[PDB]
């Protein structure tokens, strides 16, 4: 019975977790010799 009562609100927690994970993934989109050569060429 206690678990059934808990399940009444678990979907909301799952949705919140999914939204947070999606936001975190979205934030991840944008945040030596080759680099030196590129810098020299740019200069």
């Amino acid at each position: 019975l206690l678990m059934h009562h808990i399940r009444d609100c678990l979907p909301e927690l799952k949705t919140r977790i999914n939204v947070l994970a999606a936001q975190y993934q979205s934030l991840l989109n944008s945040y030596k010799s080759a680099t030196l050569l590129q810098l020299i060429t740019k200069f």
Binding site: R7, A22, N29
Partner: protein, 99 residues
């Protein structure tokens, strides 16, 4: 900024025509400002899809409520698929913009 661009276009020697390099750089910079709307639209669409999926699972599948394990598995699979597809969609949008 306009005065600086004009001075660069004029150059050391006398000249009046504006080199196309400055115009190309300015237009590219202006166009680059259009990236954020695309990301915002993608995020809004993803959130709307997640809300639709949650509503369908909770309401449109009342029978599925009798098997919470299956519901959890379906939700996890859908979330994994969306996470996998998100970078592909972002790369496609970036390629389309760069084209």
């Amino acid at each position: 900024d306009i005065l600086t661009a004009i001075r660069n276009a004029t150059g050391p020697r006398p000249a009046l025509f504006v080199p196309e390099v400055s115009f190309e750089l300015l237009v590219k910079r202006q166009i680059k400002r259009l990236e954020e709307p695309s990301l915002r639209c993608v995020e809004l669409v993803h959130e709307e899809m997640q809300r639709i999926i949650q509503h369908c699972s909770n309401y449109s599948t009342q029978e599925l409520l009798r098997f919470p394990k299956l519901h959890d598995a379906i939700v996890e699979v859908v979330t994994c698929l969306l996470r996998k597809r998100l970078p592909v969609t972002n790369e496609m949008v970036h390629n389309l913009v760069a084209i």
